[PDB]
Each structure stands twice: as C-alpha cells, then as structure tokens.
C-alpha cells in the first residue's frame, strides 16, 4: 500500500516501517544528537564565562536521555528535516515571529474619522490628504516625532519591521491611493475571492498598524492597541492641521481610534487574567482568517491543515506551552499535527471517503452523516497506527494519536456538511471511539472536553453554546487542555474550505494578513517553521544596535 506518511518513516527509521521489533540502549545516550552536543558545549562555555561556576545544564542528572533513537522530524509538504529541539518555540525564531506578527496587528477603520473631518472639523479629505496621513503615520508609528527634533525618538533600525498599511473595498479610492503602503485586494487575491471580500467589506477604508515587534517584546499584548491609537491620533492631528485642545478633537479622537478598532484577541477574565491581543483571546475563525492558504491553494485539505499547523504552534506551543504552564512545554504535543504527512494522509482519506459517499457538500448536517464519517475515519486512522509500528513509535504519546485521528474525522465531517459544530461533534465521537478501540486516550487531562463536548457541541445554553468559529481558548471546556485548540481552528477552516469561502469569520483580518510587508508570511506556515528550525529565518525585535559587541 502507498501512504503519504511512508517516506518520513523510511527516512526517520532504519528498520522497516512494518517491522515489529528493534533494539535500544546502544545509541550512546544524548551524544547521538548534534543539538544536545551543541547544548553541552554552549552550557560549559556559558557557565564558565557568564555564570562564574553556577551549574546551568546538567544532562547527567535526571533521566538518562537517548536510551532510544532520537528521531528527526520532517515538516509536512516540505522536503526538509530537523531535530525536535529546533521545533521548540524558544529555539525557533519563526514561531516567535508568527506570534509577534499576530500580536502587533491592529486594524482601525477610517470612515467615521473622515466623516468627522469633512463635516464637523470642516477639513476636506482627498486621496492626496490620505497619502499625506499615511506618510505621517508611517514616520510616526515606529518611534517617530513629526517635525519635532527636540522630542525623544526610537532608533529607526530598532523598528525596521514597523509599517502602516491601508486597504479599502472602494476601487477608485484604491487606484487613486499610493501603492507604497496599500494592501491591494485585487492583485493579492483571486478574482472571485477579491469580489467576495470587497462585497463583505463594502466601500469602507481601513488602516493596518504593525506596531514594532520590540514593543511587544518589552511590554504585553494590550500595549499594541494603545500604541496604535496614540500614534494614529498624533498623525491625524499632524497631517491634518487641527487644534488639539477642543471638544471637536475629542469627538474626532473617538471617531479615529475608538470607533472601528478591530483587535486580534479579547481580554480574558478571572484566573486567566490577560489583556487584549493575547493568544487566549483569539477565536478559531480569526486564526483561520490569519492563515492565507485560500489565496494560493484550492485544496480544502491543505487549507485546513495550514490552519491546523498555525493553531498548534500558537495554542499548544506558545499559549498553553508557556503562557498557561511554562517549562519545557508542549512542543511535540503540537508538532505531531504538522511534522509528517500522517494528518495529511488521514485528512486526504477523509476527503476521499466523503467525496465517494456524500459528494463534496451534498448532505445537510444530520446525526447519521456525522456518525458514519467520523467512525470510518477513526477506524482507518487507528488501523494505520496498528499495521505500522514506526507510525506508533513516531506518535508515542496517546494524546500526540487521539487529536490527529479526531482532527481528520472532524475535517471529513466539515467537508461533508459544511457545519463547524457538526465537525466538532465528529471530533468528540472520534475521541470516544478511539478510547474504546485502544482502551486508551491521551494524558491523564486529557478528555474533559471530549466526553463533555458531545453534549456541548450542539448545546443552546448560555455558557455552553457557541459556533466553533466564535470559540477559542477562553471557551470554558477548552481552557486548560493541550492538543485540541489548534485542531479546532482547522475544523473551523474545513467548514468554509468545503464551501470555497474567501474568509471564515472576519474579512478585515483576512485582507490585513495578506500584506507582503509582514516578516512572517502566513501563506506557508509549515515552510517558515522549517526555515526557523534551520536558523535561516530573520526575525524582528532584536536590540542589536543598542548593545555592546563584546
């Protein structure tokens, strides 16, 4: 038989993938991996120079590592391999920039501001004036002070990643504006997607403020909205020469920086207390709109799986990995959704089975379609683990198999029906069928939301009901446990990828993250994590110009 995950198993395992036996305890320990050896030399040098004898890294104490073969990791749809330590979010600059670009993004609309300028302030708003304002905000957003040399300013090379962009559904305003700082919908999207997004947005103008990454490094996520609002107000009162001491300026300030602000994430309450633009506040549909695979691909499985990879690397690796727990983290809890083509093979089988039986989107979402599609995909995914011992050895944790199989089942249900809640219902059925198949499920966590979910997937109660696009890490069932949130966003994307939709939840987020000026390009999230694993990703937020070289 031919399987998509077979090639990675041939490369990662010396033995035959179907062979049931191997040997251990003859790999030399941690010396089998070049990353561990590099860590050891770096630790000795760092201790002796900086730490003045205080021990930092001691591989001798603790578990004797390397008793089994430390396998390398492929990255799905990419022809490159890396060690598992390179996929850790602290060791991978691409994952850090993935979160940095999302954190530093604020979308503000300029239509109430223009209306207040035209009517209440008596100032004409022309495309030339909009170009002047865009020049002013592009100078002023990173650290700049317009025509005030006495003012203290941030070093420009320290904020090279900062940009202020504009986009609009109004076409004649778009061609009348400067292309230097314009996100052109027509040339960045296909014709049907551009028409759909222009219809959804309307005839309104929006500005995208990319606050510099270092601001998010030093401060928190709620800093970004205040930074963008302050600089937008300053650039508006500078480019348009307005008095900054009257009540009309207060009304214009509301219209310009408090009327149509679109934030990436909401604030979180209680014991998970956090500000806006933190990854616990990002809904699954918003993250689906962040990833831009519908722009460059027509395959619904690939469109869902790029969102799966981005959601894994954000929610499981960064948010739950450090923000909620900390430590070594949950890196290969999440990489198993995007290392090999295991999830790719399972999702392509789900798509093939749905296309053979129910067509592309030929059935209304009922119970029976959910049951039979999720059961078939779960049985196939589990027997694939059964007849490939190398596949079982790769996904050694039962959580890093439950999620994969349930994500494939939910993706298949979302193909068949187009409803995201039906897809999450298929996910929950797949989880309990996995539990009865292997007499096993994840970690010891791991199915608070998977035995509960069944009842809360189609609930209508206040704290139990939400569409899956409106759900996120602050959803009460999904608040704590790893291995679900990233795959939920792919299921939410799979509902709209089956319909061929241009966006999932927010058209403005979809257009904003199509910007070529972003350092992390969200068109191929798997490929750039590979680039950050091979140390060829140029990240932002480095204070190299304010630090000594010795």
């Amino acid at each position: 038989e031919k399987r998509l995950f077979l090639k990675a198993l041939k490369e990662k395992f010396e033995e035959d993938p179907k062979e049931k036996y191997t040997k251990f305890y003859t790999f030399g320990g941690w010396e089998q991996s070049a990353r561990k050896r590099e860590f050891v030399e770096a630790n000795e040098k760092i201790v002796s120079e900086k730490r003045q004898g205080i021990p930092l890294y001691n591989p001798d104490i603790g578990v004797p590592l390397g008793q089994r073969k430390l396998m390398p990791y492929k990255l799905s749809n990419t022809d490159d391999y890396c060690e598992g330590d390179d996929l850790h979010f602290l060791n991978n600059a691409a994952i850090q920039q993935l979160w940095d670009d999302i954190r530093r993004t604020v979308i503000v609309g300029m239509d109430t501001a223009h209306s207040v300028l035209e009517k209440r302030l008596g100032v004409e708003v022309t495309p030339e004036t909009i170009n002047e304002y865009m020049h002013t905000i592009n100078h002023s957003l990173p650290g700049g002070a317009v025509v005030q040399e006495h003012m203290v300013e941030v070093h420009p090379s320290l904020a090279w990643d900062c940009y202020a962009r504009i986009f609009t559904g109004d076409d004649e305003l778009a061609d009348e504006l400067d292309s230097r700082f314009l996100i052109d919908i027509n040339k960045l999207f296909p014709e049907e997607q551009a028409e759909t997004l222009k219809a959804a947005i309307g005839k309104k103008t929006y500005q995208v403020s990319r606050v510099p990454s270092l601001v998010g490094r030093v401060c928190d996520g709620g800093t970004i909205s205040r930074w963008s609002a302050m600089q937008i107000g300053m650039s508006f009162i500078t480019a348009y020469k307005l008095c900054a001491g009257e009540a009309a300026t207060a009304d214009f300030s509301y219209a310009s920086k408090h009327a149509d602000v679109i934030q990436m994430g909401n604030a979180l309450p209680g014991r998970r207390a956090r500000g806006p633009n933190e990854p616990g506040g990002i809904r699954f549909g918003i993250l689906s709109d962040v990833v831009q695979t519908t722009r460059v691909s027509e395959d619904p499985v690939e469109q869902s799986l790029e969102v799966v990879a981005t959601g894994a690397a954000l929610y499981d690796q960064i948010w739950l990995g450090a923000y909620m727990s900390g430590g070594i983290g949950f890196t290969q809890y999440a990489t198993a959704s995007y290392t090999d083509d295991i999830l790719d093979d399972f999702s392509y089988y789900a798509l093939d089975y749905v296309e053979k039986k129910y067509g592309r989107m030929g059935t209304k979402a009922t119970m029976d379609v959910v049951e039979d599609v999720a059961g078939e995909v779960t049985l196939y995914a589990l027997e694939q683990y059964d007849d490939y011992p190398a596949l079982l050895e790769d996904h050694f944790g039962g959580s890093q198999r439950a999620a994969v199989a349930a994500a494939a089942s939910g993706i298949g249900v979302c193909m068949a029906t187009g409803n995201s809640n039906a897809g999450v219902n298929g996910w929950y059925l797949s989880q309990i069928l996995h539990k009865e198949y292997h007499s096993r499920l994840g970690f010891y966590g791991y199915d608070l939301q998977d035995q509960c979910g069944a009842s809360n997937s189609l609930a209508i109660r206040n704290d139990e009901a939400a569409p899956l696009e409106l759900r996120g890490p602050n959803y009460p069932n999904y608040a704590m446990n790893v291995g679900h949130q990233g795959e939920y966003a792919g299921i939410a994307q799979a509902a709209h990828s089956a319909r061929g939709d241009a966006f999932a939840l927010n058209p403005l987020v979809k257009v904003a993250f199509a910007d070529p000026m972003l350092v992390f390009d969200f068109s191929k999230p798997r490929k750039e994590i590979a680039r950050g694993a091979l140390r060829e990703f140029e990240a932002a937020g480095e204070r190299d110009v304010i630090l000594p070289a010795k």
Binding site: K20, R68, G397, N425, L458
Partner: protein, 259 residues
C-alpha cells in the same frame, strides 16, 4: 434482581474485557511471587519495618456522629491510619493482557476504596499501604493481568507502551528496571518501580507466550482482532454519543425519540 452484562460485543477481546469487569470471574493464576518480593519491588518500604502513619487510628481520634458515613465499613489500612501509596503499571500496545482503561474499570469494579487513574503510557492505583500491598500481590502481580514482558511496574520515566518490543519480546525501559536472563528464560527485576537498585534481583517468572497473549488481551488491533469485527461495541459507542448530544441539546423525551 438485575444481572449485569458489563461490556457489549461478541468478539474475544470483548469477552476478555467482560471477564476483567466481572468481579465474580476468577482471574487465572500464572505466577507465585511472595509478599516480601512485591513489597521490595514497589520500593515504598523494606520488608520488616512497621507501617508508617499519615493520621492517627480512627479509634484513637474522635469524630462527629455521622450516620451516613459510619455505616460504610473502612479498609484495614484506613482504621490503622496508614499512608496512601501507589502502584503504577505500563502496558504495551502489542497484545498486553491488561490495558489502562480496562485495568481502571476492573480495579474500580473489584477493589474497595482505591483511586485509579489512566493514561496512555501508565495506569496508577492509590490506596492505603497495607491494603495496596495485599491486593497488588493477590491480583495485580500473579494473575493474567500481568505479563513480565509486555507490562512493567514503573513509578517514573514511563516510556515504551507504544514502542516496538526488543529481540527478547520485552518492553522498552529507559531506566532498565527489568532484565531478561537467557540461561534461565525468566525475567528479573533489578530496580524498584522508582528506579532505585535493589540489594538482590527478584524473579517474577517467565514471559507469557505470544500465542497465549493473543487470546487474553483486551486491546483491538488490525493484526489481532479489530473493531470492524465487533460492530456492536461501535454501535453502543455511537448510541452513547448520540444520547449525549441530544441530552445536551434539549433534555426532553421528545428529543430522545430520535435516538
């Protein structure tokens, strides 16, 4: 009265699960390990010292008069105020006779006053120390629930439940608490479940053969028997899922007409 049916399914694996769930089913005896050996393998205490105490005995301390609490008899370790200790097993996915959810369910349906917890790589039981030693030696070690090759008692660094067996048919163990001697064919324990080495190796016995392991396992496998050969368990699972969904939506009799 009501006669229990424990699990659905007509396949051999479902029959083994029903046998494990049934408290009136006599588990097949395969080994004979003395109590001192099991105590020294758990590593909580040496055989010879008294049981240490986490709280005074129930007779010495005084309580309020609670009618509902005092008509349940306690364990012998509870009235002696013994500390709560653990025994933790890792079960291989290649036809181990006991499986984590199966074990948990069997231990909660058979033993009194135990805390059972399941994971992918480990299953742990917490109970009072004397009772824990008693049921561990009587049930968990020398029955069909244990195989020295495919099941190892590991208190920490559990890894190997989903890995391939070695050339001796034994599970992977990073700490190597379990060794196989070829000149006798038995299996020896050189460390306790935590990983501290013992004074002398303790023999647990010969590994169960693979042909016997196929007919006593409680896991579904494509190379063994699969869930596709047991549609009744899948139907029960789908019924449970549909009942959960309908109860979550609207918990009325009219909603459950579409069951």
């Amino acid at each position: 009265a009501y006669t229990p049916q424990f699990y659905p399914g007509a396949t051999k694996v479902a029959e083994n699960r029903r046998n494990h769930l049934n408290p009136n089913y006599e588990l097949e005896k395969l080994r004979e390990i003395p109590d001192e050996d099991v105590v020294k393998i758990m590593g909580h205490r040496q055989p010879g010292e008294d049981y240490k105490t986490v709280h005074p005995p129930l007779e010495e301390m005084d309580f309020v008069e609670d009618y509902a609490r005092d008509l349940v008899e306690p364990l012998n370790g509870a009235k002696e105020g013994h500390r709560v200790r653990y025994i933790q097993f890792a079960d291989s996915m290649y036809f181990a006779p006991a499986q984590p959810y199966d074990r948990s369910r069997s231990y909660m349906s058979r033993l009194r006053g135990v805390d059972a917890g399941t994971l992918s790589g480990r299953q742990v039981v917490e109970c009072r120390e004397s009772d824990l030693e008693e049921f561990s030696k009587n049930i968990l070690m020398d029955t069909e629930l244990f195989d020295p090759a495919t099941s190892g008692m590991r208190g920490a660094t559990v890894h190997g439940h989903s890995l391939r067996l070695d050339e001796n048919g034994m599970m992977f163990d990073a700490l190597q608490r379990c060794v196989f001697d070829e000149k006798t064919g038995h299996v020896m324990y050189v460390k306790d479940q935590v990983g501290k080495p013992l004074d002398a190796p303790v023999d647990v016995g010969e590994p169960i053969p693979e042909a016997k392991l196929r007919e006593i396992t409680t896991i579904y496998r494509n190379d063994g028997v699969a869930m596709r050969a047991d549609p009744d368990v899948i139907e029960v699972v789908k019924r449970i899922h549909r009942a959960r969904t309908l109860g979550g939506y609207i918990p009325t009799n009219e909603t459950f007409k579409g069951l």
